[PDB]
Design a protein around this nucleic acid. Sequence first.
DNA 1: AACTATTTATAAG
DNA 2: TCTTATAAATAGT
Lengths: 89, 89
Amino acid sequence: KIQIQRITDERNRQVTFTKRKFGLMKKAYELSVLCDCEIALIIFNHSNKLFQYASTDMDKVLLKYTEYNEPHESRTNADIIETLRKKGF
Amino acid sequence: KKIQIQRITDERNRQVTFTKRKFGLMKKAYELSVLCDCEIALIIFNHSNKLFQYASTDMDKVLLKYTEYNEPHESRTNADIIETLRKKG
DNA sequence: AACTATTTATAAG
DNA sequence: TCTTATAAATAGT
């Protein structure tokens, strides 16, 4: 196992990335179908190249999002760090 | 114990798979975010159009960057991933 | 790439 | 909530 930290190697991160992201798209695709929901993923690498996923119409979702006015779940890496760290392994 | 990628017809099933499988997505994203040094943004509407969001850093900054993006880029759908797991066995 | 030793993700109870 | 048995994810080789 590795602990979650910046892959300092260059050929490593560009491989982990290229596959770990397909994972994210997979898990999303699956959740998308199972629970019947719209999803939209957006990934910029360190060199600002775009990679995107959407169960359906990407921009229709990103729009719906801007219009949303109620409060709603909003997580950051910090939120998730402190939800796994408050979870003694 | 494994499941088929198909609409959970039960109501309090999907509403549980969802609530946890999505924290997985956020997790997997959070990890990829840190490891390979990249900006990521998740947008999920459930079937009743309640919003859930994740962003490694600033959601707005990423959604902007996205609308500015002009080059071609990786652009997946459920179809693309169906036909990438169907052409695999 | 491909293989497998390991770890993680999660379905049922 | 909380295991736990089964399964998927991916780091090492």
